[PDB]
């Protein structure tokens with residue numbers, strides 16, 4: 030039994046999907062959720078550097094959002110742990126070529142989903 | 151619970167694990183390195199695998215695990231003929247991936263390399 034779904038990319042105990050199309054942040058989340066996954070929950074610098082190597086030049090949504098004055102939260106609503114900086118004053122995070130940035134959630138970008146591999150309890 | 155499908159520093163794709171080198175070696179020394187890790191120079195088995203390697207590898211040329219006798223069909227490391235899933239340019243004896251596709255050169259040239267092997271959940 031494969032650790033990751035067909036055409037997804039395996040790194041450590043996680044599985045990643047890089048989109049071909051563009052969507053706004055919420056619709057990308059809906060796509061990831063339909064496949065038992067979330068917008069990429071990036072948990073370490075190593076993970077970030079893996080994603081940046083693969084992603085290519087397009088901006089890619091990840092699974093961090095905030096209310097404008099509040100801290101960044103993971104998809105589950107837990108406050109995120111600041112493993113890398115995020116540029117800007119936007120409500121929705123994405124990966125550009127230098128790291129993490131932010132934008133209005135209604136903009137259309139490619140996206141990354143992540144999920145644990147199936148052999149995780 | 152369980153264990154990672156691939157070793158640390160290897161990337162998973164379609165039931166295999168891939169290692170992208172940071173150093174350079176000739177084709178035979180690159181293969182010796184892969185062998186030490188129970189792996190082979192990448193046995194590229196699809197157009198989708200080709201695209202995956204081109205996308206992850208970066209700007210450097212990387213050796214892969216196809217070779218041929220000068221004038222004959224490309225062979226995998228196990229000696230059996232390759233199925234021709236894409237073009238391989240050039241008149242060289244040993245295959246590699248450049249910035250755009252698959253090409254070929256003299257086996258003594260020093261380049262980055264890619265190893266592949268099956269993930270642990272195979273069998």
Ligand SMILES: *[C@@H]1O[C@H](CO)[C@@H](O)[C@H](O)[C@H]1NC(C)=O
Nearest residue numbers: 070071072103104105106107
């Ligand atoms: C919420 O999600 C993040 C990233 O997936 C994880 O690190 C964190 O522990 C989670 N907290 C929960 C489920 O309480």
Ligand SMILES: *[C@@H]1O[C@H](CO)[C@@H](O)[C@H](O)[C@H]1NC(C)=O
Nearest residue numbers: 052053054055056134135136
């Ligand atoms: C987000 O995308 C969906 C799907 O295309 C669309 O229905 C919706 O209007 C979008 N939201 C905004 C604010 O444009």
Ligand SMILES: *[C@@H]1O[C@H](CO)[C@@H](O)[C@H](O)[C@H]1NC(C)=O
Nearest residue numbers: 193194195226227228229230
């Ligand atoms: C030779 O290698 C190719 C590519 O990995 C594969 O199709 C075939 O199974 C191999 N032959 C063996 C293991 O006998």
Ligand SMILES: *[C@@H]1O[C@H](CO)[C@@H](O)[C@H](O)[C@H]1NC(C)=O
Nearest residue numbers: 175176177178179257258259
């Ligand atoms: C490849 O390079 C190594 C240096 O590590 C050298 O020892 C070896 O003989 C070379 N062999 C071939 C076949 O090119």
